Amino acid sequence: TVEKSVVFKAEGEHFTDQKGNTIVGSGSGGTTKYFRIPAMCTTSKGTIVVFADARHNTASDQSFIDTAAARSTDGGKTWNKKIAIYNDRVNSKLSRVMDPTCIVANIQGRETILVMVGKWNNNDKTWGAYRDKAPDTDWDLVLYKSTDDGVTFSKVETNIHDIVTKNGTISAMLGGVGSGLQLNDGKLVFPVQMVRTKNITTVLNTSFIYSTDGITWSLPSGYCEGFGSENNIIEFNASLVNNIRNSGLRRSFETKDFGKTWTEFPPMDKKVDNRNHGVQGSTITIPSGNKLVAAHSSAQNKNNDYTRSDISLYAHNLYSGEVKLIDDFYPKVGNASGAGYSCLSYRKNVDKETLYVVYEANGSIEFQDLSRHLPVIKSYN
């Protein structure tokens, strides 16, 4: 496919609202100022769908944001863009939908793309600051789906708000960021992050929600330690294993009882160092013969700060516990205003295998085809 391309250009995109009016951002010429938090999902048709926060006015988290979607049917050479999910537009300074997590799955025979984003309107502080209510009244977690290969998206009426309210100890919940997965048994699984109510000692926890149809969701009874909460889950034999953001070394836990109890997973626990503050990272599995190998992307953060330099691809040997840097695909110092995030996507359509990444590059979202690295990754078992 193309080796590298720009999916969304900082200060170079113009979006229209649901009425057809142009959204005037703070970028030059009234363009969208900054893009963050990329999520990518590839379909059985080879279609690449990329989601990202379109932070129209500033890179700040508490700002005016819509979820943009870019679709490529030519291997990432050209992109068709639009807004997939619009914020409520209650507050022109703060209304937002943010931090996408997507899943491409076959739900009862229908290939579907799901995108889940957190939604806020009047909260002006970071989401972790709201722990008085269960749940926070300004918050919501919305799910949209596409059943036509990423062309149109529509809201799914879900029971997610209900399960959170019923739990009673969760102030807000968000996807783990990047991509979720469909288990071997067909269940849809979104890794999640959660801010607990003020009474709970642990402020953050990680877990997941699962569903068979994408409409009715469930939360398991247990909780995994929170750390930097952003996380991805992979299926390994009869276990679900997560890979969590943490200031310093990443953490990885395993559940053998479907979310009831979690224990450290040695093969990936404390293997990659993201240094100061930590960063979101993407972790997926790639089959090789009858075995599995985990591919992972996150920043080396050579400056030990918010610049999160050197977004790299790592291979994790799930059997021996060995880790190897495969490719430092973005060996640059990022913009401290918001940098370092990424999302990997592997797919084998018939006999064609592709490994793609999407990542933050100074306010823009870039795409790279990393398929040439597959033989090396696949040998790590």
Ligand SMILES: CC(=O)N[C@H]1[C@H]([C@H](O)[C@H](O)CO)O[C@H](P(=O)(O)O)C[C@@H]1O
């Ligand atoms: C919902 C939300 O706030 N998401 C933001 C999170 C969040 O604030 C932290 O994880 C603390 O919870 O921070 C990151 P970053 O600043 O590390 O790049 C950007 C995300 O868009």
Ligand SMILES: [K+]
């Ligand atoms: K933040």
